[PDB]
């Protein structure tokens, strides 16, 4: 009962096909078609006839604020239940802001709304906040990445912050917010009343001092499960400042994003004393930051501890070299709670990935995915993999994505993938490319075993 279109544009032969059903689903996706405000007016009238209507998402149209406008005229009928709304890079900018109050009120079935990648600027969120304080919206989801807002917005989404009891994500991403912005945004979140979820404040100009606050709302914010402070320049200085926040017995912080953050070793170390203590903190990524073998290695010594209980760990473009192989290989021997490891674009070469796959290769692993895209994997180093595919039962995920690998290497990968004992679900192998002769190969496996799919 969804829709969904994609990159397929639309003739003005199939545009009156489709009108009609666009009265009848539940879910309608119109993923960058060629929508325009010509459009806008034929959708106003056909949703405004759609008794079931759950979401809707318009992403990628230039319909500005005039097709906008219309189409939340359609959306504000008697049998109106929407839900989820996106109208994510639509050209809405500040004009056509001033509908928000009277639409966001209008719809009190509203969970989640995308504003995303629209230059509303600091205008323009004045009056999405105005609305959103109404009481008769009970807003749960929030997206304002790149909308060219500025620190003067975070006043206002501080006060609906406070006022608000009803937010569980809030994300604004790639906002330059600054630090004082970020000050102020914090502010509000320390003394609001609504049990917020998922923060996420990535690329905003964050800077160590701001580690001293959200240092202070992540101790207390009990409610807190995922958060995003990648792309930013916190430095071990302002992972310092966090880290204690993380260790309160009131922090059930999940999912931590660290990546491009100007970490290193010395920071690494830091984040550890979190790793062992917190049985809660599941997922970490720290790619980007120029960690080194040196850091690898203290990742692992946590990895050891049997206290640790983290799932995903993302070290993707880290500076690691074939040498931590030894221990990543090591702790992949004895952990029992890794999951899903991400060693993409490191240097690992074909010296390095087989010390992992001997290391994978022993009964009583519990690794299920293994990324290795850009890590040097030449044909020999296929190899290798190939042996472990037939030895190894833990790995459900494999990702060889853009190494040096022609048609030799993947036809030994193909050998493996062809046994019954193989249990590999994914073999992921994008930006590789082979003869006719392999792919045909290729396409007759995927018929022989359909529980598989190498995705390319």
Same mark, same amino acid.
């Given at each position: ?113 995308? =504003? ?16 959103? =304080? ?7 989801? =929030? ?41 102020? =945004? ?22 160590? !001092? ?11 914010? !009990? ?26 017995? !009131? ?206």
């Amino acid at each position: 009962m969804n829709l969904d279109i994609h990159c397929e544009q639309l003739s003005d032969a199939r545009w009156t096909e489709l009108l009609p059903l666009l009265q009848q689903y539940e879910v309608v996706r119109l993923d960058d078609c060629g929508l325009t405000e010509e459009h806008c007016k034929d959708i106003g009238s056909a949703l405004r006839a759609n008794p079931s209507l759950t979401e809707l998402c318009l992403r990628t149209n230039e319909l500005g604020d005039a097709g906008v406008h219309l189409v939340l005229q359609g959306l504000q009928s008697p049998t109106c239940k929407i839900q989820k709304l996106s109208l994510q890079n639509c050209s809405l900018t500040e004009a056509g802001c001033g509908v928000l109050p009277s639409t966001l009120r209008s719809l009190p079935t509203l969970r989640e709304l995308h =504003l995303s990648d629209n230059p509303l600027g600091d205008a323009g969120l004045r009056l999405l906040c105005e609305g959103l =304080l109404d009481p008769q919206c009970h807003l749960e989801k =929030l997206q304002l990445e790149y909308c060219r807002l500025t620190a003067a917005s975070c006043e206002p989404l501080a006060s609906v912050l406070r006022a608000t009891r009803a937010l569980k994500e809030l994300t604004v991403s790639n906002n330059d917010i600054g630090e004082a912005g970020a000050r102020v =945004l914090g502010q509000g979140l320390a003394d609001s009343a609504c049990q917020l979820e998922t923060l996420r404040l990535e690329n905003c100009g964050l800077t160590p !001092a701001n580690c001293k606050d959200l240092c202070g709302i992540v101790a207390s914010q !009990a409610s807190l499960r995922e958060l995003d402070l990648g792309s930013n320049g916190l430095g071990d200085a302002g992972i310092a400042e966090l880290c204690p926040g993380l260790l309160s017995p !009131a922090s059930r912080l999940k999912t931590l994003w660290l990546w491009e953050c100007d970490i290193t070793a010395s920071g690494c170390r830091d984040l550890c004393r979190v790793l062992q203590a917190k049985e809660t903190l599941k997922e970490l990524s720290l790619a980007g930051n120029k960690l080194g073998d040196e850091g690898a290695r203290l990742l692992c010594e946590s990895l050891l501890q049997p206290g640790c209980q983290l799932e995903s760990l993302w070290v993707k473009s880290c500076s690691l070299t074939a040498a931590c192989c030894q221990h990543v290989s090591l702790m992949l021997t004895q952990n029992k709670h890794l999951l899903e490891l991400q060693l993409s674009s490191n240097k690992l070469g074909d010296s390095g990935i087989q010390e992992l796959c001997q290391a994978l290769s022993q009964p009583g692993t519990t690794l299920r995915v293994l990324c290795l895209g850009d890590c040097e994997v030449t044909n020999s180093g296929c190899s290798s993999l190939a042996s472990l595919l037939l030895a190894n039962r833990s790995l459900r995920e494999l990702d060889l994505s853009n190494n040096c690998v022609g048609d030799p290497g993947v036809l030994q990968l193909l050998g493996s993938l062809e046994q019954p004992g193989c249990a590999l679900e994914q073999l992921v192998l994008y930006d590789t490319y082979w003869t006719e002769e392999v792919e045909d190969r290729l396409q007759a496996l995927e018929g022989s075993k359909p529980g598989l799919r190498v995705i390319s």
